[PDB]
Amino acid sequence: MRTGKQYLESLNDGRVVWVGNEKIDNVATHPLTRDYAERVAQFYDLHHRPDLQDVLTFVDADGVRRSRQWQDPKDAAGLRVKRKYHETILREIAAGSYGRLPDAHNYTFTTYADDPEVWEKQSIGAEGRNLTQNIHNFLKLLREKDLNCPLNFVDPQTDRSSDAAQARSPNLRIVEKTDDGIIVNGVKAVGTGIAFGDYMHIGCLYRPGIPGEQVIFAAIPTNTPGVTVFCRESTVKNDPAEHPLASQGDELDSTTVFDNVFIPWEQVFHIGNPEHAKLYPQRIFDWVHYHILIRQVLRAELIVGLAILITEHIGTSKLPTVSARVAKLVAFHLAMQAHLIASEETGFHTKGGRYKPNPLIYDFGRAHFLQNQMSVMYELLDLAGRSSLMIPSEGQWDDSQSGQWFVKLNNGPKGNPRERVQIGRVIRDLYLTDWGGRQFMFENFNGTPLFAVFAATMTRDDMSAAGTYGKFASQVCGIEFG
Amino acid sequence: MRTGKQYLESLNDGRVVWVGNEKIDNVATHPLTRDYAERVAQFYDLHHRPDLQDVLTFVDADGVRRSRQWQDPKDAAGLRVKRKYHETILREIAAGSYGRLPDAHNYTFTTYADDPEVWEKQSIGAEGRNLTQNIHNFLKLLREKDLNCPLNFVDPQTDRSSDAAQARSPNLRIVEKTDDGIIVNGVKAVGTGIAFGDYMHIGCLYRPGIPGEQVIFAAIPTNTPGVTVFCRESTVKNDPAEHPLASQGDELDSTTVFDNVFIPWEQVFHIGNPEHAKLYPQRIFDWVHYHILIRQVLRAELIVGLAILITEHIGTSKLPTVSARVAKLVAFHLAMQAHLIASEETGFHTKGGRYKPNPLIYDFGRAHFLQNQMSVMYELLDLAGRSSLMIPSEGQWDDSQSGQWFVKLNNGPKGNPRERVQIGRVIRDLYLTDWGGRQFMFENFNGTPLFAVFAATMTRDDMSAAGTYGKFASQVCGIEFG
Amino acid sequence: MRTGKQYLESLNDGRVVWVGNEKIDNVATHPLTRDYAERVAQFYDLHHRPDLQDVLTFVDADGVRRSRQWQDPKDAAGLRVKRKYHETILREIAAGSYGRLPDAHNYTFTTYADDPEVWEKQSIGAEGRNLTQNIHNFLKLLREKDLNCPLNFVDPQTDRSSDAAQARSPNLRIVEKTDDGIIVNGVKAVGTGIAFGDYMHIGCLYRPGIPGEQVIFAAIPTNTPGVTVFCRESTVKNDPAEHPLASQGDELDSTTVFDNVFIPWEQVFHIGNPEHAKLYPQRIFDWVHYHILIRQVLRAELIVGLAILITEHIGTSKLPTVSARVAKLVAFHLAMQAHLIASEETGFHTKGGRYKPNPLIYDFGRAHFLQNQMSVMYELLDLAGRSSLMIPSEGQWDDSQSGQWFVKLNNGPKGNPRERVQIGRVIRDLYLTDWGGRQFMFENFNGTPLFAVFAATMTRDDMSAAGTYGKFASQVCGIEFG
Amino acid sequence: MRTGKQYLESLNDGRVVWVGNEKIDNVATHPLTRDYAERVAQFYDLHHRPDLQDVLTFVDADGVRRSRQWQDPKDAAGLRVKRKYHETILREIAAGSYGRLPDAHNYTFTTYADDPEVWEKQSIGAEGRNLTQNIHNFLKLLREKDLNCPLNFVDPQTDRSSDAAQARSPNLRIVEKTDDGIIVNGVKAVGTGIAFGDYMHIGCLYRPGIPGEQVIFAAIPTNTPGVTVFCRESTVKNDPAEHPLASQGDELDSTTVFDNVFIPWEQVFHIGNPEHAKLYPQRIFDWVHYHILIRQVLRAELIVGLAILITEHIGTSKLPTVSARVAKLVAFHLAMQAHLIASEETGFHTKGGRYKPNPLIYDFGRAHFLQNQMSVMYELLDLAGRSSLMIPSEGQWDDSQSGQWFVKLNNGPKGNPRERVQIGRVIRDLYLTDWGGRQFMFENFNGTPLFAVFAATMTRDDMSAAGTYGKFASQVCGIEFG
Numbered sequence A, B, C, D: 001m002r003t004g005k006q007y008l009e010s011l012n013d014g015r016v017v018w019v020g021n022e023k024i025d026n027v028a029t030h031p032l033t034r035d036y037a038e039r040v041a042q043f044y045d046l047h048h049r050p051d052l053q054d055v056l057t058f059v060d061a062d063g064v065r066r067s068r069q070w071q072d073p074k075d076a077a078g079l080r081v082k083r084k085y086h087e088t089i090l091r092e093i094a095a096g097s098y099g100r101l102p103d104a105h106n107y108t109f110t111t112y113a114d115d116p117e118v119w120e121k122q123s124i125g126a127e128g129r130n131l132t133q134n135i136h137n138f139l140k141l142l143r144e145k146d147l148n149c150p151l152n153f154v155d156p157q158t159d160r161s162s163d164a165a166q167a168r169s170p171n172l173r174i175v176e177k178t179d180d181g182i183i184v185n186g187v188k189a190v191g192t193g194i195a196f197g198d199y200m201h202i203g204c205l206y207r208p209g210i211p212g213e214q215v216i217f218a219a220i221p222t223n224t225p226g227v228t229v230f231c232r233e234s235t236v237k238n239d240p241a242e243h244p245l246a247s248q249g250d251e252l253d254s255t256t257v258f259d260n261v262f263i264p265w266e267q268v269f270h271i272g273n274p275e276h277a278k279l280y281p282q283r284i285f286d287w288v289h290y291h292i293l294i295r296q297v298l299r300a301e302l303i304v305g306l307a308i309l310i311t312e313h314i315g316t317s318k319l320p321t322v323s324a325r326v327a328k329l330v331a332f333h334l335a336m337q338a339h340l341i342a343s344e345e346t347g348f349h350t351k352g353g354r355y356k357p358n359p360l361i362y363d364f365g366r367a368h369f370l371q372n373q374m375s376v377m378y379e380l381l382d383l384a385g386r387s388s389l390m391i392p393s394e395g396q397w398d399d400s401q402s403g404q405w406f407v408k409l410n411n412g413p414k415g416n417p418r419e420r421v422q423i424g425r426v427i428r429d430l431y432l433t434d435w436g437g438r439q440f441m442f443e444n445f446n447g448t449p450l451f452a453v454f455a456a457t458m459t460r461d462d463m464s465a466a467g468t469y470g471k472f473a474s475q476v477c478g479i480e481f482g
Helices: A004-011 A034-046 A050-056 A076-092 A102-114 A117-121 A131-144 A280-284 A286-314 A320-345 A359-388 A403-409 A418-431 A434-445 A449-455 A470-477 B004-011 B034-046 B050-056 B076-092 B102-114 B117-121 B131-144 B276-314 B320-345 B359-388 B394-398 B403-409 B417-431 B434-441 B449-457 B470-477 C004-010 C034-046 C050-056 C076-092 C102-113 C117-121 C131-144 C280-314 C320-345 C359-388 C394-398 C403-409 C418-431 C434-441 C470-477 D004-011 D034-046 D050-056 D076-092 D102-114 D132-144 D280-284 D286-314 D320-345 D359-388 D394-398 D403-409 D417-431 D434-440 D449-460 D470-476
Strands: A016-019 A022-024 A057-059 A065-067 A173-177 A181-192 A199-202 A216-221 A227-231 A253-264 A268-271 B016-019 B057-059 B065-067 B173-177 B181-192 B199-202 B216-221 B227-231 B253-264 B268-271 C016-019 C022-024 C057-059 C065-067 C173-177 C181-192 C199-202 C216-221 C227-231 C253-264 C268-271 D016-019 D022-024 D057-059 D065-067 D173-177 D181-192 D199-202 D216-221 D227-231 D253-264 D268-271
Touching (some): A004 A034, A034 A102, A050 A057, A050 A076, A076 A102, A076 A286, A076 A320, A102 A131, A102 A280, A102 A286, A117 A131, A131 A268, A181 A268, A181 D403, A216 A253, A253 D403, A280 A286, A286 A320, A286 A418, A320 A359, A320 B320, A320 B449, A320 C320, A359 A449, A359 D359, A403 D181, A403 D253, A418 A434, A418 B470, A449 B320, A470 B417, B004 B034, B034 B076, B034 B102, B050 B057, B076 B102, B076 B276, B076 B320, B102 B131, B102 B276, B117 B131, B117 B268, B117 B276, B131 B268, B181 B268, B181 C403, B216 B253, B253 C403, B276 B417, B320 B359, B320 D320, B359 B417, B359 B434, B359 B449, B403 B417, B403 C181, B403 C253, B417 B434, B434 C359, C004 C034, C034 C076, C034 C102, C050 C057, C050 C076, C076 C102, C076 C280, C076 C320, C102 C131, C102 C199, C117 C131, C181 C268, C216 C253, C280 C359, C280 C418, C280 D470, C320 C359, C320 D320, C320 D359, C320 D449, C359 C418, C359 D320, C394 C403, C418 D470, C470 D417, D004 D034, D034 D076, D034 D102, D050 D057, D050 D076, D076 D102, D076 D286, D076 D320, D102 D199, D132 D268, D181 D268, D216 D253, D280 D286, D280 D449, D286 D320, D286 D359, D286 D417, D320 D359, D359 D417, D359 D434, D359 D449, D394 D403, D417 D434
Parallel strands (some): B016 B227, C016 C227, D016 D227
Antiparallel strands (some): A016 A022, A057 A065, A199 A216, A216 A268, A227 A253, B057 B065, B181 B253, B199 B216, B216 B268, C016 C022, C057 C065, C181 C253, C216 C268, D173 D181, D181 D253, D199 D216, D216 D268
């Protein structure tokens, strides 16, 4: 299993990356990137913890002990082992704040494994290139070298004004093929953790009128010549004492510029078929969406805890008004958790025999989180009061003359004044900080319930009078069904 | 297995029942009560349906074919057989509108079976009376006679007069104990289906300061001398053509008066111990609470169906704003269902080996429905538009001169004019009649479903910082957990 | 000023009215309709009350004393006198439950008075019919004869049936034209109080591709031969003691069928011009929309009062969790009231010199009621608890042997046990009867979601970046605007 | 009228203030503070602009031209002139983001002016002192020297420890009564802009069982010996090109500690009486609450604008689902504005002849904002998409090789790619930074808006059944009203 130290070294590979105005010499070391880079290191080192060997690792089919990240769930029971693996990672690293650690996006490659043939036999202009072997090859490399391969699938909003038939810029497209590979030019909008990966997982989602020279699926090293990762600015805090979570690292998002970059045939999985990009890219995001639900449920759990802690510390916890508000937080958690459990119980098997959770249920589970996060945030903030705003710094607390005033301001029915600040600082980082803010934003444009969901229900499912919801009502109304 | 015929006959036993201003001579026959009575009769006859023998009946341990209402789930799979039993009943009778058919409240008696001794052992003032044997005797009678025994547990609201503690409350209490039994005087409030039972299941839920003599658990014949069942006025409709659901029967709710009622020792399960009334009465309500959720999930399913039907018939189903609203109804059902399924997967076993669903989850599931049901039905009413209001009556539709106008008014893309009226009539019955409005109040007649459920749970498990919710937040805040 | 007796007698004119399957011989005396009929009578008699002379009547410009329903406001103060007139009617008649009493819809005719000629000169196919004198004549008749003229504007639902081009719709249309007048055939849908008017106010609203032959504005007697008023079934209760409100009358809604009805030229205001129906029919609903808001603010006030009465009678009013819930109701009333007041302070004058309230503000006020009334219903019901459901009849309350149990059950800190039943009966009528339910549907139809509220705003106002909301944002963003 | 320069120089007076760990040598010049200080300076310079003399200044009673912040409204029209003054300030300075510029809290001193004597006559422990003259003295000083005097009323949370809420509080209390003044020791919990005022307005709000020794009202210089202003860490951004709003200054919040400071008698307004602290501190906060509402209506206006702009630039504005959402935003602003209008129309006069707005209405107005602010934020962000996240810094946009790609990326149906970035940056600052998050918290921190607002309301208005809401419901229920 890869080591954190090894991960950090592999970052200094001459990849060209900007964080805002600032060009980055070495992601592992630069003040704007090093902290998150060290979280990914932390991710790898976690798997060497003797006490975590059972939850984090398994003996693979080749006799090699690996991260359960690579393990395939065969049934619901298997899926709970997988979930427990993911939850252990999240609980350990920054209060489950990071959504694109390696286990999150790496598992998406299993959709290829489920049926590698289709990706080659459905390519347009793939001639006699062995794309199927390209899949098998990378899956082995990915797994055995324990690589980190972030997703780069999102396209620009694509000009909603011009003649769509003339699709020039800014989308990434094949501008020429040769005997050695293809050349691509354009950009990938919104990619998370691109600067911190070994390879990037280039792909796309179907949209009506998608050219075909734009249907590209590949995995290329991050430092492939002609690639520039332009990151938004980093929101990491420099004072760990004042910001226990925000100072731990910003999971950067970026737009990736491909400047006529050459992609060897060996690194391509599929090209050219808009029809194939319909539904197959969709499956690629299944495990990502499932992982998000896991993260969401843990977050709901954290908020309940924070609410119970801050509220017991101040001594308002036994007020009917307060407890009723805590009840809403518990409700929210139980609602999130129920979508998670129900989805895991109503799953199915992929071609590769992998047991997949029910997408209808976990996708609505995600919609439920997005639609109510504002509500619960407001409740936590209301319960915390000034504890998330008027936080005395260490210098003020430790002051000889006035330090004792702060101790008195924060003392409660359970003593331990320090705890008020500790709790308040977590709530602040989470909800009153740039860093905490991007944690809405992340899962936000990713969905938009009303919008996406019903464009994402009648896609694999049937929400018509002839579907499952039509039976009972029809019978009750005395109308024939079927 | 009892027939509806036998059931109907058992109603004419001299029970004293008021419906509004009138004393009812025969509940089975009276215009105000006969319809619901025939719904219970229908419940019984259903089990004799040759094609329903598998879902509805089983062979008991004594080699007797009985209703599956008497069957014990011993694992999750068995629980789903139980639920399928209940759902078959629900879908078949008045669109799952009735909440206290015999299978809903009869199974709560297994709570006694799980551990009969404790009810006697914990009694105060009932020594030498064989309460344990009383339990076994009634369980046997209830089952073998196939009796219907509604719960009568709900107490009068507390009188908040400053001087309340210096006079009698209206609550039911033991007023005398004798060699033959106990004399009982007072009121049980908001009882559902009392007038239609063979026996009533007398009991109480704990409240701070509840006196020993008010703690009574027993089952007595509905027609016990001194018992008067005061029902609310009946909202049953007379025209089945215009009212397909509301004409099928009104599940009456009652205030039961006990005028110095004599109860033989043989009908008594427990008396005198407030401490016992803490956890145990909650166990009795578990199974009925779980049944309510089953019914609530079907109702959510019905609502989505009606929305899809009426929305497709009018031709508004295609509009994106309309699709989004139908989707959020799908969301509601999915959330209800998720609670149901999650509670079934995380259940536990009683001392009697019976597999119970998770009360934390299904009870918060109930609270989710109760808090949202009005908002949800408003969406349905809004989507149906004028079709739930401007409904042509049969005579207007059949009118030789003007009927054709109504056919045109109700014609849409689907091209079946009659259907719009069929759907309009069930929506109207469900949410625009007094019969329909009853469904909002009879299970939510106290203050705040969410908090009520939350307060009940923290008397059953730890919702404090020392409980399961404090662990993750404590860790994150650097606070010790134990 | 017309008397109630005069109104009642005018109803007996051989008009053809169905209520459900029942043909009505006289709307004034029939069991299904007499009660609402008597509410309109009450409306008239109210104006003869000496003590009410000031708020209800004024001396007209001809020196005759008439109801202030005919009085014109010329400024903000004048609008207040008008509203005070409306509110006094509403408060007097059935808790403000009726929304189409004569003063509500009669005043819409002043739309014609603001500019009568335009209706003439914009007509197509009415050359030489002096529709202007027609207008002036009816306006005088309307007022001096003190008639009641309900609106009949609404059209059958836009359905794309099998062939909405090969076959004709149910819409009212000009079928033939003569030297005497016009012949119309078709239907007006969802009219309110039609069966109770002396005349009906025929009109239409614009709709993409509406035929000129369907554009018709007129006022004809209700008993005009060939006219049939088909009412939905009546929901009025037969027992005033148990239903203090729902027994007072049902403001019926109807479908009006015109079987080749002849309208004399002298009863026509405009025909034939789709362009005219684009802006003027909306002006007609302006005053009714304003009256709707007034009724809504009142209803919010009623609801607050009910919550305060029931919570005080029970004794929970001082509980912090109850105070907070009641605050929500007060918040809703104040929000409704704020829109009301703000619209009156920011109005404008019509050509007729009449001061109109701000439509943007009072229409959004209306939308606020529609979007929050379920939440308000829910909040009141939750506070009232069992009192709105478990209501003892007079017979039960007065029973000699068991009646005293109900006194004890309903006793509280403020004594007067009977009051709890009184309050509960009002709440039950308002929210848990057929009659109460239609007071939801009154507006539960007049606009698909918001597919017609910003398409009815952005296109009827600026509501663009160049509009009034674009100024501040543009500045702050350092952009354009100008 | 004071000058920005003059104000800046007044700051360097040896006041001891910390921003986090940093002791501040000069509030006017320090990097953590100078930006907000220059905003207060901007506030003063605004008054000297010739183009704004009309709206910002007036000739006072003494003949001297002054800022309209010192002007008294004597009627509704006058109040509107005052509102136009405040809004002009807000719209000019950082998009109305600052809530405690001098005009916001300075006007609260008019409370004293309304009735000066009562503050002395009600004092306890100051027998023989003339305090009334002090009010007139400071009032003159305040106005003529054009001083800035922030509020400092909020006390430490009354922790239910035992001896923390008993005597040994951090609460500011009178420890010593000299014949030259008093000596005070303790803490003022939360204070906004204290470190930026010439004086601080010391005061307190009543709470059950508050000592008379903690009831102190006064105005002392900020650089008084023994006073330390401890500020939370500052959230000011460094780069105005990336942060157009957040770089403009952080309106800091403080805990002020009084280590045995001596207040001269000529600065005391009242001491010793808890009964006085009941209603009079409420009147102090009246004008502040009104100003907050003015500010909240502007922000709601701003939010609508941003939503329109971004939605139009992306070309998503025509979508029915989107325009529906924008209409909700317009509804929020309309609702907020209506509370504002209505409060101004239903005000009253103070003893001093000042026309004050209606507090019941503008306080429920504030509550409406506090409750909905989170949801409307979410809608803005969801509408903006990646624009508020994936923002190309200046350097990336200007880049010679790649810049072009960002231009094509932000191109929309309306061109002007740069605008997407400009709007996006404004939104990010508002809701995705800590500077922004402070704004939706600093508002409410005391408890629950709707409840507390209503709790404070029951004190000013009669909200019982004997109150104004009891009338209508009582008549409807047949209950006597008095």
